[PDB]
Amino acid sequence: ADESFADFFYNFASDEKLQLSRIVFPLPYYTMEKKEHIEKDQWKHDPLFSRQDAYTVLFDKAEDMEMDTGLTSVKIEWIYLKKGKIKRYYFERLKGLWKLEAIDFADMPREDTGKEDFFEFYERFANDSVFQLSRLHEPLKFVTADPEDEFQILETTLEAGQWFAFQPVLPRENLTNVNYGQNENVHSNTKVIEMKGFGNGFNNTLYFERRHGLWKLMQFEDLSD
């Protein structure tokens, strides 16, 4: 009887009347160190990322990817790379029904203590191919699903040319996140971008690490079905 987040999410993004009915009104909107409220009359249908061909899920470490169904909290996030902003949607499962409880629209939490920020790095990595080439770890690991036996992988290293040929279309302006409980700390020296499609079985994962003060692409895994 409890709603599955994935099934609710699709319905919330695609049906306007359902969306309006599943949001707390007046909606708490935390922005610029103050708190606003969005009135029901002011709400604009939010298709979230239902008009995208793919979306991303972020992890501080690769081990954080191995995971309840008794989970009642989900944060959906939109990372505005160029604006340096983040929009967060607080979804909560109440009496088995998912509801939108609040929204944050704030400045991208920046890594302090004088250390290269992952999202500032990623923005340049995706938008500056010269910079992108300079930040590939040597060697650059490539993992793909073995087209034979079950759960098997093929592992090789990539030359710069091969990385640019086989890479997924890297998001240049926005990233997303689905936080279902994994650590989301501005101080991690590792970061993982998992890219997933909508009913096409596409799955590409990118593994980054801050090495001697600079973020580098460590590994590219293509687990696309």
Residues that bind Cl ion (CB under 5 A): 56, 136, 138, 140, 159-161, 171, 176, 211-212
The 3-state DSSP class for residue 194 equals strand
Beta carbon nearer to its own copies, 67 or 130 = 130
Q: Does 20 bind its own copies (CB under 8 A)?
A: no
Q: Give the C-alpha separation, 14 to 3, whole Å.
A: 16
The CA angle 66-69-72, to the nearest 5 degrees, is 110
**Shorter beta-carbon distance to Cl ion: residue 22 or 144:** 144
The minimum distance between CB 108 and its own copies, in angstroms, equals 24
165 contact choice in its own copies, Cl ion, none (CB below 5 to 8 Å, kind-dependent): its own copies
Whole-number minimum distance, CB 126 to its own copies, in Å?
Answer: 12
Distance in Å, CB of 133 to its own copies, minimum: 4
165 lies in the site for its own copies, by CB under 8 A = yes
Q: Are the C-beta atoms of residues 189 and 196 closer than 8 Å to each other?
A: no
Do 190 and 209 contact (CB within 8 A), yes or no? yes
Cβ-based nearer residue to its own copies, 164 or 198: 164
Interface residue with its own copies, options 70, 147, 161, 199 (CB under 8 A): 161
Distance of CA 2 to the CA centre of its chain: 25
Helix (H, G, I), strand (E, B) or coil at 123: helix
The binder of its own copies chosen from 20, 154, 160, 214 (CB under 8 A): 160
Which range binds its own copies by CB under 8 A, 28-36, 52-60, 130-138, 194-202?
130-138
Which residue in the set 18, 71, 133, 154 belongs to the binding site for its own copies (CB under 8 A)?
133
Among its own copies, Cl ion, none, partner that 95 touches (CB below 5 to 8 angstroms by kind): none
Contact present, 221 and 144 (Cβ < 8 Å) = yes
Under rule CB under 8 A, residue 154 binds its own copies? no
Secondary structure class of 84 (helix, strand, coil): coil
Helix (H) or strand (E) holding 16: helix 16-21
CA 201 and chain centroid, separation: 17
Pairing type for strands 203-211 and 214-222 reads antiparallel
* 94 binding its own copies? (CB under 8 A): no
